[PDB]
């Protein structure tokens, strides 16, 4: 269990950054759980034997506010490695404060979904800063020290109130799908990934259902997935990709 | 461990084997070289 958490957290994607139509390509291992603008300072640095930088994969712009692992999963995982990303220049990248604010809005949405009483809002600005720093400085211990409490639910309940997930289909150019979904069925048994898809997105059941670069069995309990295969934003970002 | 958890763990180790471990040293080496080329 704890090993799954770490394995998710430390996931890397090998990436080749090539300048759009002399600059050598630039290679980097990207953290799956982070955001491009955070980890690509050195890529921007490097592509400056030139006289506002943005990224694109095979025609699609890569958006600042998605996790890197999701973008790869959805857009490039069908292709061979390294991820081939094209670097582009503007003549005139959100702030770290802007990213932190997006991140925290996401955590807050996830919190309001999971708990009857908002745990995140009972925390101190100290703890929120540690959540962000934990993500930004790639420190699993510091982040999970706080994130632990966000993953608690009262023992009598068998799971969160609602599971925070977002389902992506084919391209980030289509909006992701969300709706209230409980981890436990009326009969009392645990809902599966299969149950979630069957409800929220019946056409995924030909298709690949990818979470953090792997394909869980559909029979996998959703509550556990939520606790273990969420991104740090506390969401399950799920890709539905055409085979193969 | 139930079959599905075994599955997730296996697939995450395999994933790391293919993606992170394969590329770490060669990307580091390439960057050493890149930095050595920037000295002209």
Curated annotation (Swiss-Prot), chain A:
UniProt-reported outcome of changing residue 100 to D: In SCAR25; reduced conjugation to ATG12; decrease in autophagy activity
Keywords recorded for this protein, A-Z:
Acetylation, Apoptosis, Autophagy, Cytoplasm, Disease variant, Host-virus interaction, Immunity, Isopeptide bond, Membrane, Neurodegeneration, Ubl conjugation
Q: In which tissues is it expressed?
A: Ubiquitous. The mRNA is present at similar levels in viable and apoptotic cells, whereas the protein is dramatically highly expressed in apoptotic cells.
Q: Which Gene3D superfamilies would you find in this protein's record? A: 3.10.20.620, Autophagy protein Apg5, helix rich domain (1.10.246.190), Phosphatidylinositol 3-kinase Catalytic Subunit, Chain A, domain 1 (3.10.20.90)
* InterPro entries on file: Atg5, ATG5_HBR, Atg5_HR, ATG5_UblA, Atg5_UblA_dom_sf, ATG5_UblB
State where the protein is found: Cytoplasm; Preautophagosomal structure membrane
**What is the designated name of this protein?**
Autophagy protein 5
Q: Which organism is it from?
A: Homo sapiens (Human)
Q: Which gene encodes it?
A: ATG5
Curated annotation (Swiss-Prot), chain B:
Region: Interaction with ATG5, residue numbers: 4-34
Which superkingdom, per the lineage? Eukaryota
Q: Where is the signal peptide?
A: none
The record describes its post-translational modification as:
Proteolytic cleavage by activated CASP3 leads to degradation and may regulate autophagy upon cellular stress and apoptotic stimuli.
Where can this protein be found? Cytoplasm; Preautophagosomal structure membrane; Endosome membrane; Lysosome membrane
Function in brief: Plays an essential role in both canonical and non-canonical autophagy: interacts with ATG12-ATG5 to mediate the lipidation to ATG8 family proteins (MAP1LC3A, MAP1LC3B, MAP1LC3C, GABARAPL1, GABARAPL2 and GABARAP). Acts as a molecular hub, coordinating autophagy pathways via distinct domains that support either canonical or non-canonical signaling. During canonical autophagy, interacts with ATG12-ATG5 to mediate the conjugation of phosphatidylethanolamine (PE) to ATG8 proteins, to produce a membrane-bound activated form of ATG8.
What does the UniProt entry state concerning the protein's domains?
A: The WD repeats are required for non-canonical autophagy but not for canonical autophagy. The WD repeats are required for the recruitment of LRRK2 to stressed lysosomes.
- Give the record's disease field: Inflammatory bowel disease 10: A chronic, relapsing inflammation of the gastrointestinal tract with a complex etiology. It is subdivided into Crohn disease and ulcerative colitis phenotypes. Crohn disease may affect any part of the gastrointestinal tract from the mouth to the anus, but most frequently it involves the terminal ileum and colon. Bowel inflammation is transmural and discontinuous; it may contain granulomas or be associated with intestinal or perianal fistulas.
Self-association and partners? Homodimer. Homooligomer. Heterooligomer with ATG16L2. Interacts with WIPI1. Interacts with WIPI2. Interacts with RB1CC1; the interaction is required for ULK1 complex-dependent autophagy. Interacts with ATG5. Part of the minor complex composed of 4 sets of ATG12-ATG5 and ATG16L1 (400 kDa); this complex interacts with ATG3 leading to disruption of ATG7 interaction and promotion of ATG8-like proteins lipidation. Part of the major complex composed of 8 sets of ATG12-ATG5 and ATG16L1 (800 kDa).
- What family classification does the UniProt entry report for this protein? Belongs to the WD repeat ATG16 family.
Q: What is this protein called?
A: Autophagy-related protein 16-1
Q: Which organism is it from?
A: Homo sapiens
Q: Which residues of the full protein are shown?
A: 10 to 49 of 607
């Amino acid at each position: 269990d704890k090993d799954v958490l770490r394995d998710v957290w430390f996931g890397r994607i090998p990436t080749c950054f090539t300048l759009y139509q002399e600059a050598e390509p630039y290679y980097l291992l990207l953290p799956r759980v982070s955001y491009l603008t955070l980890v690509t300072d050195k890529v921007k640095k490097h592509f400056q034997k030139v006289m506002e930088i943005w990224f694109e994969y095979e025609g699609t712009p890569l958006k600042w506010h998605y996790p890197i692992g999701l973008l790869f999963d959805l857009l490039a995982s069908s292709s061979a490695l390294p991820w081939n990303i094209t670097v582009h220049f503007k003549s005139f990248c959100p702030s770290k404060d802007a990213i932190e604010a997006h991140f925290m809005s996401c955590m807050k949405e996830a919190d309001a979904l999971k708990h009857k009483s908002q745990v995140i809002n009972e925390m101190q600005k100290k703890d929120h800063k540690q959540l962000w720093m934990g993500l930004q400085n790639d420190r699993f211990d510091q982040f999970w020290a706080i994130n632990r409490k966000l993953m608690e639910y009262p023992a009598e309940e068998n799971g969160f109130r609602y599971i925070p997930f977002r389902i992506y289909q084919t391209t980030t150019e289509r909006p992701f799908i969300q709706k209230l979904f409980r981890p436990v069925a009326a009969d009392g048994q645990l809902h599966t990934l299969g149950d979630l898809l069957k409800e929220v997105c019946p056409s995924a059941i030909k298709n690949q259902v990818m979470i953090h670069g792997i394909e869980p069995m559909l029979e996998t309990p959703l509550q556990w997935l939520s606790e273990h295969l969420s991104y740090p934003d506390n969401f399950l970002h799920i890709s539905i990709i055409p085979q193969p | 461990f139930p079959r599905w958890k075994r599955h997730i763990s296996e697939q995450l180790r395999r994933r790391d084997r293919l993606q992170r471990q394969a590329f770490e040293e060669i990307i580091l080496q390439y960057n050493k070289l890149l930095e050595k080329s920037d000295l002209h």
